[PDB]
Paper text:
Glycoprotein 2 (GP2) and uromodulin (UMOD) filaments protect against gastrointestinal and urinary tract infections by acting as decoys for bacterial fimbrial lectin FimH. By combining AlphaFold2 predictions with X-ray crystallography and cryo-EM, we show that these proteins contain a bipartite decoy module whose new fold presents the high-mannose glycan recognized by FimH. The structure rationalizes UMOD mutations associated with kidney diseases and visualizes a key epitope implicated in cast nephropathy.
To gain further insights into this process, which was previously visualized only at low resolution by cryo-electron tomography, we reconstituted in vitro the complex between UMOD and FimHL from uropathogenic E. coli (UPEC) UTI89 and studied it by single-particle cryo-EM. Despite high conformational variability, this yielded a map with a nominal resolution of 7.4 Å, whose comparison with that of free UMOD showed density for a single copy of FimHL bound to the D10C region that presents the N275 glycan. Consistent with our binding studies, the majority of the UMOD/FimHL interface is clearly made by the decoy module; however, the density of the complex hints at the possibility that the C-terminal region of EGF III may also contribute to the interaction with the lectin.
Residue numbers in the entry:
A (entry chain U): 25 to 316
B (entry chain F): 1 to 159
The structure:
C-alpha cells in the first residue's frame, strides 16, 4: 500500500522480495513489524491485529514467521492450537540417546532408558549383574552397555596357570573383565585345591563349586586360594556363564595380594593322554585325566 | 543398597524419594521436647556387603511446615546431637549387612512461644531429609529424600 518498490534492492533482508512482471513490492512477513518498506526484528505477538497463539503456549518469533511453540509433548496445528502429538514419534522433536526410550509427558519429552540402568536419561552407566538374562553390562568405547559375555569376553592362553607349573612368579592384579582360557592355558578354571608354589605363582587360586550346565546364566560362585598348610583360608566370589560351543566365560577380578593367581585345569580333549609318556601310564578315569 | 519405610514405601537402586508418615504427640507444652524417633521409620540395607563398604551421611536436615515456623530443636544423628536445621554434614554411617538396619536419626523439637492453637496440622510436611551415600569403592553418590509428614495435630498451649 505504501511500500511499492522500484527495484528488489530496496527490500531489506528482513523482507521477502517478489517480482511480479518486474514490479517489486517489499512485504515483510509475520514476525517483522513495519510498513513493508522497512521492518524491524519484533515479535508478531504485538502487531496491530495481534497474534493468535494458544494461551498455554508462548508466542515466539522464528526466522520467516512468528510461531507458537507449545510446551513439549504437544505441537501446534494451525486452527486447533496445541494439539496432542507423541513427539517421541518425530525425530525432529526428540533427540534421545539411542538406547534410551523417549516417553511423552506434559510439558516435555523425557528420554528414559529401561529399568535397571543408572543414568540421567542420556548416559545410563549400568552395573555388572543388573542386565537381563543372556546379557551383562560391559564397556563399548566410552559408554556402558549390556551385551552377551559369550562374544565380548577376552581370552587367555597362559600355560603358566596349569596346576603342575610350580616354577615362576606372578601377580593377577591385571585381570579384570570377562576372560576365556584356550590352548595350553587350559579349558576351564581349576576346581580343586592346588598345592602351594604352583601355577607359576606363590599362592594358587581355584574355583570352589563346579562349572554350570551349558547355557546356564550368570551365577555367582565361590573361589578359594591355598597358602601355608591351609587351603581356602580366604574365600572370594566369582561369576561363571556357560556359552554355546561348550566353553565358559569368567569374571576375573584382582586378588587382595600380589602373590595370588588363578589356576586352570588341563583341557583334556583326549580320552587318552598321549601327550604324556608311554612309560608314564595314562590313568583314564572319570574326572581324573592324568598319567602315572 | 535399597531402603524402605516402616509403612513399606521403598526406593529402588538409583535413588529417589519416599514418604515417611510418623506419629506425633497431640499436645506439647512450651519448653518440652517433641521427640520424633525416625530410627523406627527408615531402614536400609547393603545389597553386596561381601566387598564394597558403603558410607551413609545426612547431608542436610531442614525444618518444614509447622516445625519451621513454630518450633526449634536439634537432630540426634548416630547418638550425637547437631543443630536443626543442619549446618554441617553428619559423620558417615557404615552399612555392612543385607539385614535391614535403622537409620539412626531422632528429632528433638522444642516449641517457641506461641499465642496458642494447633501448630502442626495433619497431612503437613514437617521435615525433609536428604540421605547421602558414599563408599570406598567408587563415586557412588545417591540421594534418598525422606518427606516427613504428621499423622495428627499438635496443640501448643498458650505460654
Ligand atoms: C570349598 O572349600 C571348602 C573348604 O572350606 C570345602 O569343604 C567345605 O567346607 C565348608 C566350610 O565349613 C563346608 O560348609 C559348611 O560345612 C558344614 C559341614 O559340612 C556339611 O556338608 C558336607 C558336604 O559338603 C558334609 O560332609 C558334612 O557332614 C556336613 O553335612 C551337613 O550339611 C548340612 C547342610 O549342608 C548342615 O545343615 C549340617 O550342619 C551338616 N552336618 C550334619 C551332621 O548334618 C555345614 O554344617 C555348613 O552348613 C552351613 O549352613 C547351615 C545352614 O545355614 C549353618 O547352620 C552352618 O553354620 C553353615 O553356615 C555357614 O554357611 C556358609 C555358606 O552359607 C559357609 O561358608 C562357605 O561354605 C562353602 C561350602 O562349600 C565354602 O566352604 C566357602 O568357602 C565358605 O566360605 C560356612 O562355612 C558355614 N559355617 C560353618 C561353621 O561351616 C556348611 O555346609 C562345606 O560343607 C565343605 N564341603 C565339603 C566338606 O564337601 C569344599 O569341599 C570346597 N568345595 C568344592 C571343592 O567344591
Ligand atoms: C564380573 O563379576 C565381578 C565379581 O567377581 C564383578 O566385579 C564386581 O562385582 C560386584 C558384584 O556384582 C559389583 O558390585 C555390585 O554390583 C551390583 C549389580 O549386580 C549385583 O546386584 C544386583 C541387584 O539387583 C540388580 O540387578 C537385577 C538383575 O540382576 C535387577 O532386577 C535389580 O533391579 C538390580 O538392578 C544383583 O541382581 C546381581 O546379581 C546378579 O548378577 C550377578 C553377577 O553380577 C549373578 O552372579 C547373580 O546370580 C545375579 O544374576 C549382583 O548381586 C550393583 O548394583 C552394586 O551397586 C550397589 O551396591 C553397592 C554395594 O552395596 C553400592 O555401593 C552402590 O551404591 C549400589 O547401591 C555393586 O556395583 C561391582 O560393581 C563389580 N565391580 C566392577 C568393577 O564391575 C565384575 O564387574 C563382573 N563383570 C565383569 C565384566 O568383570
Ligand atoms: C484464532 O483464535 C481462536 C481463539 O483464540 C483465542 O483468542 C486468541 C487471541 C488467544 O488468546 C487464544 O489463546 C484464545 O483461545 C482459535 O479458536 C480456538 O479457540 C479456543 C477457545 O477460544 C481455543 O481453546 C483454541 O486453542 C483456539 N484454536 C487455536 C488457537 O488454534 C482459532 O483456531 C485461531 N485461528 C487460528 C489459530 O488459525
Ligand atoms: C496446556 O497444556 C495442556 C497439556 O500440556 C493442554 O491440554 C491438552 O489439550 C489438547 C487439546 O485439547 C488435548 O488433546 C490433550 O489431551 C491435552 N492434554 C492434557 C495433558 O490435558 C492444554 O490444552 C494447554 N492449554 C491450552 C489453553 O491450550
Amino acid at each position: 500500500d505504501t511500500s511499492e518498490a522500484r527495484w528488489c534492492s530496496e527490500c531489506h533482508s528482513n523482507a521477502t522480495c517478489t517480482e511480479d512482471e518486474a514490479v517489486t513490492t517489499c512485504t515483510c512477513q509475520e514476525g517483522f513489524t513495519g510498513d513493508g518498506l522497512t521492518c524491524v526484528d519484533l515479535d508478531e505477538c504485538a502487531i496491530p491485529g495481534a497474534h493468535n497463539c494458544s494461551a498455554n503456549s508462548s508466542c515466539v518469533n522464528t526466522p520467516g514467521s512468528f510461531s507458537c511453540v507449545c510446551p513439549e509433548g504437544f505441537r501446534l496445528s494451525p486452527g486447533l492450537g496445541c494439539t496432542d502429538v507423541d513427539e517421541c514419534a518425530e525425530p525432529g522433536l526428540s533427540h534421545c540417546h539411542a538406547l534410551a526410550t523417549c516417553v511423552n509427558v506434559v510439558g516435555s519429552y523425557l528420554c528414559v532408558c529401561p529399568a535397571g540402568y543408572r543414568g540421567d536419561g542420556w548416559h545410563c552407566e549400568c552395573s555388572p549383574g543388573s542386565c537381563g538374562p543372556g546379557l551383562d553390562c560391559v564397556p563399548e568405547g566410552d559408554a556402558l552397555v549390556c551385551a552377551d559375555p559369550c562374544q565380548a569376553h577376552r581370552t587367555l592362553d597362559e600355560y603358566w596357570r596349569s596346576t603342575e607349573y610350580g616354577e615362576g612368579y606372578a601377580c593377577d592384579t591385571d585381570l579384570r573383565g570377562w576372560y576365556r582360557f584356550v590352548g595350553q592355558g587350559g579349558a576351564r578354571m581349576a576346581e580343586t585345591c592346588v598345592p602351594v608354589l604352583r601355577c607359576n605363582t606363590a599362592a594358587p587360586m581355584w574355583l570352589n563349586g563346579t562349572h554350570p550346565s551349558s547355557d546356564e546364566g550368570i551365577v555367582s560362585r565361590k573361589a578359594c586360594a591355598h597358602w601355608s598348610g591351609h587351603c581356602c583360608l580366604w574365600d572370594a566370589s566369582v561369576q561363571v556363564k556357560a556359552c554355546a560351543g561348550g566353553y565358559y566365560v569368567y569374571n576375573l577380578t584382582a586378588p587382595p595380594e600380589c602373590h595370588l593367581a588363578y589356576c586352570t585345569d588341563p583341557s583334556s580333549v583326549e580320552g587318552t593322554c598321549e601327550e604324556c609318556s608311554i612309560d608314564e601310564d595314562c590313568k583314564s578315569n572319570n574326572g581324573r585325566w592324568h598319567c602315572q | 543398597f535399597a531402603c524402605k519405610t516402616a509403612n513399606g514405601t521403598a526406593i529402588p537402586i538409583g535413588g529417589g524419594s519416599a514418604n515417611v508418615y510418623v506419629n506425633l504427640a497431640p499436645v506439647v507444652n512450651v519448653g518440652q521436647n517433641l521427640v520424633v524417633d525416625l530410627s523406627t521409620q527408615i531402614f536400609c540395607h547393603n545389597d553386596y556387603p561381601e566387598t564394597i563398604t558403603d558410607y551413609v551421611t545426612l547431608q542436610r536436615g531442614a525444618a518444614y511446615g509447622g516445625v519451621l515456623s513454630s518450633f526449634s530443636g536439634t537432630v540426634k544423628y548416630n547418638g550425637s546431637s547437631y543443630p536443626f536445621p543442619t549446618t554441617s554434614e553428619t559423620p558417615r554411617v557404615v552399612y555392612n549387612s543385607r539385614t535391614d538396619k535403622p537409620w539412626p536419626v531422632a528429632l528433638y523439637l522444642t516449641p517457641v512461644s506461641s499465642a496458642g492453637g494447633v501448630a502442626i496440622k495433619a497431612g503437613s510436611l514437617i521435615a525433609v531429609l536428604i540421605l547421602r551415600q558414599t563408599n570406598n569403592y567408587n563415586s557412588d553418590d545417591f540421594q534418598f529424600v525422606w518427606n516427613i509428614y504428621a499423622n495428627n495435630d499438635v496443640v501448643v498451649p498458650t505460654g
